[PDB]
């Protein structure tokens, strides 16, 4: 966690509903975005931490 | 925290529609079955 490793996303789709439709994540939380909305969205790039 | 507010419903109120029921949410991917994962109770107080 002191050196964190960063994915940049771009040029690309992706089933974001998969992120808590699957059950092999413990949790899910959103801020700003609803989780729900995801799929319907659109970005000029996603940072994933 | 005597006031609260509905923090999900199936869908938008018509004007001057009224709503008091403490149903649990279903969201996706399993059922609420009175619990949780996808599933949610439907009212949140503001706790002043």
């Known amino acids: 966690v002191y050196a964190w490793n960063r994915k940049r996303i771009s040029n690309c789709v992706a089933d974001y509903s998969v992120l808590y439709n699957s059950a092999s994540f413990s949790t899910f939380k959103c801020y700003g975005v609803s989780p729900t909305k995801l799929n319907d969205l659109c970005f000029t790039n996603v940072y994933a931490d | 925290y005597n006031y609260l507010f509905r923090l999900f419903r199936k869908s938008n109120l018509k004007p001057f529609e009224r709503d008091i029921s403490t149903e649990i949410y279903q969201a996706g991917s399993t059922p609420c079955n009175g619990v ?5 109770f439907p009212l949140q107080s503001y706790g002043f």
Request: charged share 0%; glycine share 20%; net charge neutral.
């Open chain 2, 36 to 40: 949780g994962f996808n599933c949610y």
